UniProtKB/Swiss-Prot annotation:
Changing L45R: Reduced monoubiquitination of FANCD2. Changing L105A: Strongly reduced monoubiquitination of FANCD2. DNA repair protein that may operate in a postreplication repair or a cell cycle checkpoint function. May be implicated in interstrand DNA cross-link repair and in the maintenance of normal chromosome stability. This is Fanconi anemia group F protein. Its main location: nucleus. Keywords: DNA damage, DNA repair, Fanconi anemia, Nucleus. Belongs to the multisubunit FA complex composed of FANCA, FANCB, FANCC, FANCE, FANCF, FANCG, FANCL/PHF9 and FANCM. The complex is not found in FA patients. In complex with FANCA, FANCG and FANCL, but not with FANCC, nor FANCE, interacts with HES1; this interaction may be essential for the stability and nuclear localization of FA core complex proteins. It is found in: Nucleus. The chain holds residues 159 to 357 of 374 of the full protein. Changing L160A: Strongly reduced monoubiquitination of FANCD2. Changing V157A: Strongly reduced monoubiquitination of FANCD2. GO terms for biological process: DNA damage response; interstrand cross-link repair. The gene is FANCF. It comes from the Eukaryota. GO terms for cellular component: chromatin; cytosol; Fanconi anaemia nuclear complex; nucleoplasm.
Length: 173
C-alpha cells in the first residue's frame, strides 16, 4: 500500500544512487501519472542522493510547486525538516500564494480569483503544521510570517493583511 510505495521509493533511490539521473526523473515525471509519482517522491524523501531528488526538485520549480499543493501539510513539514534546502522554497510558494488572495467582506474570508488559488483553510493548515515543527524550522516560518505582516504595515484589525490574520489564528494568547 504504503508498502508498495516504500518499495517503489527504494527502487527509485537505488536507481538514482547508481545509474541520467536528472534526466531519468524528468522522463518519469512526463510519463507517470503525477499524483502517484508525487507520493512516491514524498516517500523517497523520507527514507532512512536523494540529495539527487532534492537537487532535481530545486531545478524544477513547477514540479515542486505541485508537490507542495498536492501533499498534506504534515508531510510537507516532515519533508522540509529533513531537507532544509526545500524550506525557503516551500515558504516562498506559501508567501506567493498568500499574496494572491484578497479579503471578501461578505464571506469574512480570504479568497483567490483564479482556479489555482489556495484556499484560506489550506494556507492556515500548512502554516499550523509548519509552526509545530522542530526548531530550525518553526523559527524560519515565524520570522517569514512576521516579515510579511510588518511589510503590510503591522496591522492588528482583521481584513487588512492575510499575514496579520494568519498570525492571529496561529498564536494562542
Ligand atoms: Hg510570509
Amino acid at each position: 500500500e504504503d508498502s508498495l510505495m516504500k518499495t517503489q521509493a527504494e527502487l527509485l533511490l537505488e536507481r538514482l544512487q547508481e545509474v541520467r539521473p536528472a534526466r531519468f526523473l524528468s522522463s518519469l515525471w512526463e510519463r507517470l501519472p503525477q499524483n502517484n509519482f508525487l507520493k512516491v517522491i514524498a516517500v523517497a524523501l523520507l527514507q532512512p542522493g536523494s540529495q539527487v531528488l532534492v537537487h532535481w526538485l530545486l531545478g524544477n520549480s513547477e514540479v515542486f510547486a505541485a508537490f507542495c499543493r498536492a501533499l498534506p501539510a504534515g508531510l510537507l513539514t516532515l519533508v522540509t525538516s529533513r531537507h532544509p534546502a526545500l524550506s525557503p522554497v516551500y515558504l516562498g510558494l506559501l508567501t506567493d500564494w498568500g499574496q494572491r488572495l484578497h479579503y471578501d467582506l461578505q464571506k469574512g474570508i480570504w479568497v483567490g480569483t483564479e482556479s489555482q488559488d489556495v484556499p484560506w483553510e489550506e494556507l492556515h493548515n500548512r502554516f499550523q503544521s509548519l509552526c509545530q515543527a522542530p526548531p530550525p524550522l518553526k523559527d524560519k516560518v515565524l520570522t517569514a510570517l512576521e516579515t510579511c505582516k510588518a511589510q503590510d504595515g503591522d496591522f492588528e484589525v482583521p481584513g487588512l493583511s492575510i499575514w496579520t490574520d494568519l498570525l492571529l489564528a496561529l498564536r494562542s494568547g
